[PDB]
Design an enzyme around this catalytic site. Structure first.
Site, mmCIF file in Angstrom:
data_model
loop_
_atom_site.group_PDB
_atom_site.id
_atom_site.type_symbol
_atom_site.label_atom_id
_atom_site.label_comp_id
_atom_site.label_asym_id
_atom_site.label_seq_id
_atom_site.Cartn_x
_atom_site.Cartn_y
_atom_site.Cartn_z
ATOM 1 C CG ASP A 35 -1.800 1.177 1.335
ATOM 2 O OD1 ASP A 35 -1.922 1.904 0.333
ATOM 3 O OD2 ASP A 35 -2.406 1.379 2.420
ATOM 4 C CB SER A 199 -2.247 14.249 -13.451
ATOM 5 O OG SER A 199 -2.662 14.007 -14.784
#
EC number: 3.4.23.22
Length: 330
Positions: A35, A199
């Site tokens: 994770d 992004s």
């Protein structure tokens, strides 16, 4: 040193991925959920409340000659999905894919929430976010990666998750045969303890690319892709009959649909998520309403590039002095 381990979807939907991890001496192999959105290595154990264990493999520290109780240490964690666990702490030898760390903090669960009990395939979590998020008290502990880093050939690990198929976690090297083209690296902020990046935009299907900054986290421990409501609405508007269902808890779509791809930007590069990666199947057995793999982050408070996004790429988690993230197509 290096390590390399195969990671395997837990079910037919790729709801999560498990990777075998050797703990203790002799080794006890547990299948952990790696994770990159958390920083605790915790396991089901011989200390876990018996009624809360249902099929998981447990770590028994009393059977490990290298286990040592970390005196006075406790841990307690709550995840973004509402699940939680807590317990005490041992140090022990932990190996992943041939890479060994001695003295790793292994957090033994005394209690786990129902979601963990009900998932027989996940024996614990191995956190790969920054150690500043580790919950051990009163002395915070380091992640497996943080402990291994100085010994690694290069201070990196990579995630290469498969779509409906196994994939690979590598530590200490970049497998240049595992991706196509080049890896585009992008800046990381560690301020919130995550692999947080920005992004450069998105496209839906064959549509034009929208240049827009989307701050979010690369999180292998989250199944879906959670993005701003504007972006998510633009995606689902291209699927006839798709709608946000408050009763179900997100966007659903007719199972008869063909889903468009979704592209996200990494600098000037582009990662394309095929439409089929966005299908999470019937909302309940036999239903013709299917659950979407792109959902709104509104009210999460952060955008999350979970498995839906990451499995479309070869992803480098560069833990150099100034961390960065790399993405390549594959």
């Amino acid at each position: 040193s290096t390590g390399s381990a195969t990671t395997t979807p837990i079910d037919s939907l790729d709801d999560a991925y498990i990777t075998p991890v050797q703990i203790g001496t002799p080794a006890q192999t547990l299948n952990l959920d790696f994770d990159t959105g958390s920083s605790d290595l915790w396991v089901f154990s011989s200390e876990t409340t018996a009624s809360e264990v249902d099929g998981q493999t447990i770590y028994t520290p009393s059977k490990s000659t290298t286990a040592k109780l970390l005196s006075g240490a406790t841990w307690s964690i709550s995840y973004g999905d509402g699940s939680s666990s807590s317990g005490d702490v041992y140090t022990d030898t932990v190996s992943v894919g041939g890479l060994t760390v001695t003295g790793q903090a292994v957090e033994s669960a005394k209690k786990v929430s129902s979601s963990f009990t009900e998932d027989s395939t996940i024996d614990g979590l191995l956190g790969l976010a920054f150690s500043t998020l580790n919950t051990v008290s009163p002395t915070q502990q380091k992640t497996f990666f943080d402990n291994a880093k100085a010994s690694l050939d290069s201070p990196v690990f990579t995630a290469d998750l498969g779509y409906h198929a196994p994939g690979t976690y590598n530590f200490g090297f970049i497998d240049t045969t595992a991706y196509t083209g080049s890896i585009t690296y992008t800046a990381v902020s560690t301020k919130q303890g995550f692999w947080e990046w920005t992004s450069t935009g998105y496209a839906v299907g064959s549509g034009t690319f929208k240049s827009t900054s989307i701050d979010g986290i690369a999180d292998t421990g989250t199944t879906l892709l959670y993005l701003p409501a504007t972006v998510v609405s633009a995606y689902w508007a291209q699927v006839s009959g798709a709608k946000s269902s408050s009763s179900v808890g997100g966007y659903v779509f007719p199972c008869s649909a063909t889903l468009p791809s979704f592209t996200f930007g990494v600098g000037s590069a582009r990662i394309v998520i095929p439409g089929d990666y966005i299908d999470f199947g019937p909302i309940s057995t036999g239903s013709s309403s299917c659950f979407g793999g792109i959902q709104s982050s509104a009210g999460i408070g952060i955008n999350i590039f979970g498995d839906v996004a990451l499995k479309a790429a070869f992803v480098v988690f560069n833990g150099a002095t100034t961390p960065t993230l790399g993405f390549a197509s594959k």
